[PDB]
Design a binder for these strands. Structure first.
Ligand SMILES: Nc1ncnc2c1ncn2[C@@H]1O[C@H](COP(=O)(O)OP(=O)(O)OP(O)(O)=S)[C@@H](O)[C@H]1O
Ligand SMILES: Nc1ncnc2c1ncn2[C@@H]1O[C@H](COP(=O)(O)OP(=O)(O)OP(O)(O)=S)[C@@H](O)[C@H]1O
Ligand SMILES: [Mg+2]
Ligand SMILES: [Mg+2]
Lengths: 643, 318
DNA sequence: TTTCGGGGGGGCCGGGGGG
DNA sequence: CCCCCCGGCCCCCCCGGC
DNA sequence: TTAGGGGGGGGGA
DNA sequence: CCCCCCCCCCTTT
């Protein structure tokens, strides 16, 4: 009949309040939205596009059927649009497209493929519902037979998450690769034990005695662990945050279970039924540097004689450092909408409330990939509203929005975005919002801002103001913020000044240089430099108090004045006289109570053209060996006598 | 006199879901849940004095009836709620055997849950997961962000909105009719304006005004309820001439006994929430206010410093 | 990173009581 | 005379704005 | 408007 | 089948 291409040809083309179209009119069209629309906002335009079953990609590629070009379009977007030769339309263009493609079908193979995929999803949902009702009928028949000739819990009284929890591995949606990897690792654990965990297979999982599953909340980590443990015929010994897992309890608790037979396995007699699978769930839930037992669990991971699976939500936390390279790491990513659309449709039809498949993705966006949260949202909403569609999708999504604290990189990216500092953008993301964004991680926000405020192309420059001037203003404000921070952490503990520190350290300098990140966002380098400075100051103090009885100065004077002459009288002789100057160097060292470690540290202090790394390396190894032998073959004096 | 009159906030505390005003959709959802049961884990968040504890208690009562005493475990910030409590008392309550109708469950009400420690919240996770067949949890808090993400994932989110002046007026009229309180429209308007959507504050102010003066009119209401100083600070910051701002500072704030620290903190907050002013100007005003706040915290809390702050703000605005 | 102060949780030590 | 229960220090870890 | 770069996984000439 | 689309996730004490 009519193909979307001919409609687009009819629609006016662009070169470098809305009509109610028929259902799924934009089906099979990949609409990429860019710029600013006159009447519709980005969110409103995306919602309108989804209302008609149109894929809304966040980027532009060869599959971008159409493009919605508005005011203030991204330069990269225009560059890629011209490179890929993709048509663009205006607000009236989109209006005519929705009102000029009513057949909702009959277009090219893309529309037919989309319809076939939708029918396949519906059929899968119906088949799953049929299986569920068959299971319910079987359970009811067994219950009636038992009753005819203990109180059980009826399914109607159970939470939807429990009622629809996966029963086997296949029912787990998303993270198929991770699930398969875990299954393979656990299946061949006995073979790895036979090889003493020395040989590594194709996947390299044969050298780990423990596995660590990590991912965001409500994605199926515990479910997958339990399912894999049950499938391979193991006995599960599970621990969680509800149990005491301190170092003492760990030593007196599960430690004895590492190499112990299971009595239940013996009395329930698979060949692996007598062996334990120790599941430590919510591993990040234990607090304590040493008494918590995180380090103790890491040590256990290195000698466990039975499979050990750890589960945590935050793998990069400092508390998790002991688990660096001792367990096989398995990441569970946020599942995509498609992998769970069939499950959501099955739940919707079984619970006898209507759910529009075109809004499911939005619900996922509300929950940030939290399947448990999605099921809870459906259960709570369906109690009063039996139909879910575009009529009330916006309100439901806004009400249940998951306000997750941003990470330092995301905080830096958002705070340095120039849009939020414009007249229009400031009314949506207010100053209070920016202060809250700082308070998300007050400890790291000022450091990230100071690190990344010189690596942006600004878009908020005032007329006649250069990038350098704004940078200087931001630096001045950052210095004032540092003064305020010093005030906060003094003996007076003026924590009430924290909000002001938010403005001076992050919000104001960011507003001065807000724009587009000219390059990759970098983590703050100040902490590593501070640690290096502390180490070097400790070394300098050690050297100074070794030579105190001979010199007349403070440690700073020793670094600035004495060290060059000491270099001239310690390093130059080796380079000039070869190995014949070892005696003079040793004599100078003895005169000042210096040791070999002191010699190396002194050589490590110099900068600029006096760096000694290359010079030290170029020295023949024989000279260094002779120097070490001569130093070790004699007695030396001691400056500080420890007792 | 050794006798006390019961506060009207307690005497007229709603006992059923139908007596709660505001947040109509959430109240209807709670009513439906009470009718049908199968209450899920829930987190109720919102501003102070809007009827969160009232809603939770009413829902529990309608759900459990005669079994309320046995089937409800209530814990708040005044009770012990450490990790040991979660691991022993709450676990014992969850595992407790209690025969209930075919659509009811035991309820744990953790009021002011935002004050609970991270360890207790973490320990609650598997307790909620394992015993959901017989026990359900209802958290009530002011800031939902303090609740860890795993607990939020396990609960249904109910964000309470501020009460509109219409609902406050409706409840106040019911209370007045039940108490036979002589009033005037202007007095009720003043009470509503001073309440700022706080039903508890409005009821307390009404009761205090009736006790202290009898007739509820603007004069008596304002005598009992002082005009909020944030509005005075906003007027001071928005004054066109430095002389007017200094006049307001000296007459409405300094001579009334307001401390300099309170004045400067309120100025900071009001400037932060001043949408009518350009954001960059607000940032400059905040810089000046922070300088003054640091000076006051150091110990120089004088009227001269506040006057200098106002002068600098006006210079910036010019 | 961290200059007080508060809160919480876990580990021993030791007084008292019981057998 | 010896073992166990249970109160109190001692230490160590973690916020600190709204 | 997408900071750069790497990993996972559905679609397909 | 390699290539592409598309998204998510890591940089990080
Ligand atoms: N991939 C999934 N597929 C189907 N349902 C899921 C999935 N993930 C989570 N759920 C549902 O949410 C419920 C809880 O899943 P969990 O296995 O506990 O996720 P989780 O990652 O372990 O959450 P945390 O880490 O304890 S907060 C399941 O019983 C399911 O009903
Ligand atoms: N929606 C309401 N309808 C009627 N009275 C209310 C309402 N909200 C509050 N009140 C009255 O104010 C009193 C206290 O209400 P609460 O439920 O305790 O408010 P709250 O939000 O729980 O306070 P916080 O958050 O713990 S400070 C009630 O006993 C009622 O008398
Ligand atoms: Mg879990
Ligand atoms: Mg309350």
């Amino acid at each position: 009949n009519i193909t979307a291409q001919d409609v687009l040809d009819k629609i006016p083309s662009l070169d470098l309040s809305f009509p109610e179209g028929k259902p799924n009119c934009l089906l099979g069209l990949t609409i990429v939205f860019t710029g600013v629309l006159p009447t519709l906002e980005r969110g409103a335009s995306e919602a309108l596009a989804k209302r008609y079953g149109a894929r809304v990609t966040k980027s532009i590629s060869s599959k971008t059927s159409v493009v919605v070009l508005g005011d203030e379009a991204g330069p990269k977007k225009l560059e890629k649009i011209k490179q890929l030769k993709i048509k663009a339309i205006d607000e009236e263009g989109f209006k005519q497209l929705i009102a000029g493609m009513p057949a909702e079908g009959g277009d090219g193979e893309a529309a037919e493929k989309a319809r076939r995929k939708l029918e396949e999803q519906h059929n899968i949902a119906t088949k799953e519902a049929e299986l569920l009702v068959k299971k319910e009928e079987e359970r009811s028949k067994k219950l009636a037979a038992t009753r005819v000739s203990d109180n059980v819990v009826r399914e109607e009284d159970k939470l939807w998450t429990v009622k629809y929890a996966p029963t086997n591995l296949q029912q787990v949606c998303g993270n198929k690769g991770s699930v398969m990897k875990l299954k393979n690792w656990l299946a061949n654990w006995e073979n790895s034990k036979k090889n003493s965990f020395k040989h590594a297979g194709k996947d390299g999982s044969g050298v780990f005695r423990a596995a660590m599953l990590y991912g965001p909340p409500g994605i199926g980590k515990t479910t997958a662990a339990h399912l894999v443990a049950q499938e391979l015929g193991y006995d599960i010994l599970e621990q969680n945050a509800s149990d005491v897992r301190s170092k003492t309890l760990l030593n007196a608790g599960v430690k004895n279970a590492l190499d112990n037979m299971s009595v239940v396995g013996y009395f329930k007699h698979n060949l692996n039924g007598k062996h334990f699978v120790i599941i430590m769930d919510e591993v990040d839930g234990m607090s304590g540097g040493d008494r918590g037992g995180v380090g103790q669990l890491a040590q256990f991971c290195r000698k466990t004689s039975t499979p050990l699976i750890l589960i945590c939500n935050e793998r990069n936390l400092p508390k998790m450092r002991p688990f660096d390279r001792v367990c096989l790491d398995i990441q569970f990513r946020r599942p995509d909408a498609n992998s769970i659309k069939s499950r959501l449709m099955t739940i919707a039809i079984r619970e006898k409330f209507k759910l529009d498949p075109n809004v499911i993705d939005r619900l996922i966006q509300t929950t940030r990939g939290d399947i448990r949260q999605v099921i809870n949202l459906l259960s709570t909403i369906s109690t009063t509203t039996k139909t879910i569609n575009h009529e009330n999708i916006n309100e439901i999504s806004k009400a249940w929005e998951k306000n997750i604290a941003l990470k330092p990189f995301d905080i830096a990216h958002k705070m340095l975005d120039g849009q939020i500092y414009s007249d229009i953008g400031s009314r949506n993301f207010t100053l209070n919002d920016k202060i809250a964004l700082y308070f998300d991680d007050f400890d790291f926000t000022p450091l990230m801002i100071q690190e990344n405020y010189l690596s942006t192309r600004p878009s908020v420059l005032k007329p006649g103001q250069s990038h350098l001037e704004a940078v200087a203003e931001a630096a001045n404000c950052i210095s004032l913020g540092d003064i305020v921070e010093k005030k906060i952490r003094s003996s007076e503990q003026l924590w009430s000044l924290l909000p002001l520190h938010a403005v001076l350290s992050s919000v104001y300098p960011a507003s001065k240089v807000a724009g587009h990140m000219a390059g990759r966002i970098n983590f703050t380098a100040w902490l590593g430099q501070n640690s290096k400075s502390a180490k070097y100051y400790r070394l300098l103090q050690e050297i100074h108090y070794h030579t105190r009885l001979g010199t007349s100065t403070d440690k700073i004077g020793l670094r600035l004045d004495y060290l060059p002459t000491f270099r001239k009288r310690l390093l130059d002789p080796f380079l000039k006289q070869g190995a014949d100057a070892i005696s003079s160097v040793i004599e100078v060292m003895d005169d000042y109570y210096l040791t070999k470690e002191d010699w190396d540290s002194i050589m490590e202090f110099f900068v600029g053209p006096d760096v000694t790394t290359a010079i030290i390396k170029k020295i023949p190894a024989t000279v260094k060996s002779g120097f070490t032998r001569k130093y070790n073959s004699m007695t030396h004096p001691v400056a500080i006598y420890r007792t | 006199t050794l006798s006390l009159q019961l506060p009207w906030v307690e005497k007229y505390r709603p006992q059923v879901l139908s007596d709660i005003v505001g947040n109509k959709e959430t109240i209807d959802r709670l009513q439906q849940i009470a009718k049908d049961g199968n209450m899920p884990h829930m987190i109720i968040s919102g501003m102070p004095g809007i009827g969160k504890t009232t809603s939770v208690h009413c829902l529990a009562h309608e759900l459990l009836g005669r079994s309320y005493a046995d089937g409800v475990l209530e814990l708040n910030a005044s009770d012990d709620r450490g990790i040991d409590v979660v691991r022993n008392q709450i676990k014992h309550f969850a595992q407790k055997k209690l025969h209930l109708p075919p659509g009811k469950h035991k309820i744990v009400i953790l009021d002011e849950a935002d004050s609970m420690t991270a360890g207790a919240q973490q320990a609650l996770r598997r307790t909620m997961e394992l015993y959901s067949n017989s026990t359900r949890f209802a958290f009530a808090c002011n800031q939902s962000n303090k609740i860890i993400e795993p607990l939020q994932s396990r609960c249904a989110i109910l964000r309470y909105s501020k009460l509109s002046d219409e609902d406050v007026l409706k409840r106040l009229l019911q209370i007045i009719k039940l108490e036979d309180v002589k009033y005037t429209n202007d007095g009720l308007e003043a009470i509503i304006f001073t309440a700022e959507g706080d039903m508890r504050q409005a009821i307390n102010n009404l009761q205090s005004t009736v006790a202290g003066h009898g007739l509820v009119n603007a004069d008596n209401v304002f005598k009992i309820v002082d005009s909020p100083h944030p509005l005075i600070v906003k007027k001071m910051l928005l004054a066109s001439n430095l002389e007017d701002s200094i006049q307001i500072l000296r007459t409405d704030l300094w001579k009334k006994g307001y401390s300099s620290i309170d004045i400067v903190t309120t100025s900071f907050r009001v400037t932060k929430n001043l949408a009518q002013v350009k954001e960059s100007v607000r940032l400059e005003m905040i810089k000046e206010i922070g300088l003054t706040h640091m000076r006051i915290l150091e110990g120089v809390g004088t009227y001269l410093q506040l006057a200098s702050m106002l002068a600098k703000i006006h210079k910036l605005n010019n």
